[model samples]
Target: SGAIYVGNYRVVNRHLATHNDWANLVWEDSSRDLLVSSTTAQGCDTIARCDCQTGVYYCSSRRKHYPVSFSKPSLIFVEASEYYPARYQSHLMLAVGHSEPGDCGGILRCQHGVVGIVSTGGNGLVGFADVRDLLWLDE
Candidate 1:
C-alpha cells in the first residue's frame, strides 16, 4: 500500500494474508514478488551453489536493512503470531528456530538464491513465506 525505499530502488509493498497467515508483495520497478517465509530444510546438495563453502547466510532484517538460508520442506500450520492473530495453513509457510515479531518481510537468501521472506513470529517459531509462489504470479 506504500512505497518503500531500498538503497537506489523504489519498491512498492502490498500487504497480503489468508486467515491470519500473512505475507507481503514487494515489487521492484516493474515486477511483482511475494514476500514469504524462507525454506527451513535445505542442505548443501540442495543449495549447492548457495555459498556451500560456508553453509551460512544472512536473512534480511528491517532493523539491519541488510539482506540474508534453509533446512527442508514440509506442510506446516501456524495458529497465531504476535503480528497475525489467526490460524492459517500452508505448504508455503516456513518455520525457523528464532525470529522476532517485527522481522516480517525480511528476505532470507543465500549465495545462490532467495530462500523465503519473514512473515510472522509466535510461541518459539518464526514463519517465512516461500518464494516458489512468485513464479505463479509472474507467469
Candidate 2:
C-alpha cells in the first residue's frame, strides 16, 4: 500500500498490493512525499510518488532503468525548483537516494528554464543554454 504522512498524522492512503508479492518503501523528504517501489512478474520495478498535501500520487517509470526489473538498484531523485523571471534564472535543488554513491549528487542552477535533462553512461546530466533574451516583455 502507498501512504503519505506529516508528523504524526496519516494524511493519505492507497491500496497498493493484494497478495503482497514484493514491496519496497522509499521516502523522498522528511515531510511531503513518499514513494512505493514495487516489482511485477516481468521483473520491472514501478515507482509511485505519494503527495502528503492533497492525498494524491503519480506513478512514472525511470528512464535509465527500463524493462522494470529487480536487478537494478533502487534509486530516487528529489528536486525542488524556485524560478525568478527578473533574473532570468531558476534554482534547481536535487537530492538522491536511500544509498546513492557519494559523488553522484549535486545541485544545478539554470540561467533560463530547464533546457534538457539527459542521461549518458548511467549518469544524469542537465543542460542549460542562454535564454535571457527570450523573455517576453509586454510593452
Candidate 3:
C-alpha cells in the first residue's frame, strides 16, 4: 500500500511519476497493475508479474534483455545483502543472481504481472522494490 513509483531509468517516456524528480516525493497510483501490453517497444514482448508467492522468478535488465536467470527471493538482513536501501524493508525484496549496473531500474516480471523494480545489485545478488501493487503513468 506504500509502494513508490520510480520511473524507468533509461527511457524518459517510460516514467510514471508526476514530477519524475529524484529529490521529490512523486505520488503515483499504487493500485495499478503492470499490464502485458506495456512492453511494446521496451526491447522485448514478454509479459510478466512481480512474484512473491513463488520462490523463483525471471529477471531482465538493460545490459541483458530477457529473463537471464530464475532467481529466488530472500531476506535483506544478512551481511552483504542486496543493494537496495534497507530503511524501506517493507517494500524490498532480495533476489539471488544477475543484475548489472545498467539494470538498476530493470523490471522483474513473471507469468502473472509486474513483480519488482530493480534498484541495485552486484556480486551475485540484486535488490528490487516490490512493484506488485504499484502503477505507472502513461503519456
Candidate 4:
C-alpha cells in the first residue's frame, strides 16, 4: 500500500497556531532514509545520510571551502509531519535561498502529491518521502 497522504506544508499550517520555516520542518519520517551527496565548486565532494528517526547523521568525506573550510554539500533534515495535521498540503512553498547561506533552503509547501525541490544558488537539494516509500529503489 502507498504511504498515507499527509497534507503539504500550507494546508497543514492553515489554522495551526505554530509554523516553522521549510528548513526547520522538512524531515520527519521515521521509516524513510536519506542519502545526500554533492561536490562543491572547489572540487570538494561528499556523500552522507542520516537516521530520520534517531537524528543520527553521517558523512563519507569532508572538505573545506577555501577561506571558510565549510562543510560543503551538507545534508539537512526537517519534520513537516510534526508541524501540521493534514494530508496533502502545498508543495510549492519549497525554495532555495540565493543569498548568504544560499544552500540553507527548504520546502515552502506541497501541491498535488509531489513535493518541490529548492536549489541553493551554490548547488544544493532537499529530498522527501513518505514512510512507505522510504527506501524503495523502484521509486
Query: Which of the two, 3 or 4, has more TM-score?
Result: 3
Best of the two (1, 3) by lDDT: 3
User: Under the 3 Å rule for N, CA and C atoms, how many clashes does model 2 have?
Assistant: 5
Candidate 1 Cα misplacement greater than 4 A, ranges: 1-73, 81-85, 93-95, 136-139
TM-score of 4: 0.18
What is the per-residue lDDT of model 2 for residues 1-139, given as tens digits with 9 covering 90 to 100?
1222222222111122123312343222222121223332232111222111111112122213111111111223324322111222121212221212221111111322211111101233221111112122100
Who is ahead in TM-score, 1 or 2? Answer: 1
**Candidate 2: pairs in clash:** 43-68, 43-69, 44-68, 44-69, 45-68
Query: Over 4 Å off in model 4, which ranges?
Result: 1-97, 102-105, 122-139
Give the clash total for candidate 1: 14
lDDT of 3 at 71: 38
Question: Which residue pairs in candidate 3 have backbone atoms (N, alpha carbon, C) closer than 3 angstroms, thus clashing?
Answer: 16-137, 48-113, 49-110, 49-113, 49-114, 49-115, 50-113, 50-114, 50-115
Cα-based RMSD of the predictions, in order? Answer: 10.5, 19.3, 8.7, 16.2
| Cα TM-score per model | 0.44, 0.15, 0.44, 0.18
What does the lDDT read for residue 69 in candidate 2? 10
Ranking by lDDT: 3, 1, 4, 2
Query: Which candidate number maximizes lDDT?
Result: 3
Per-residue C-alpha lDDT of model 4 across residues 27-134, encoded as one tens digit per residue: 432222222221122321111232222111111112111111112222344334443333332211212223222211222222122221222223332222222123
Compared with the true structure, the alpha-carbon lDDT of candidate 3 equals 0.41
Candidate-wise lDDT, in order:
0.38, 0.20, 0.41, 0.24
**Who is ahead in lDDT, 2 or 3?**
3
Clashes of 3: 9
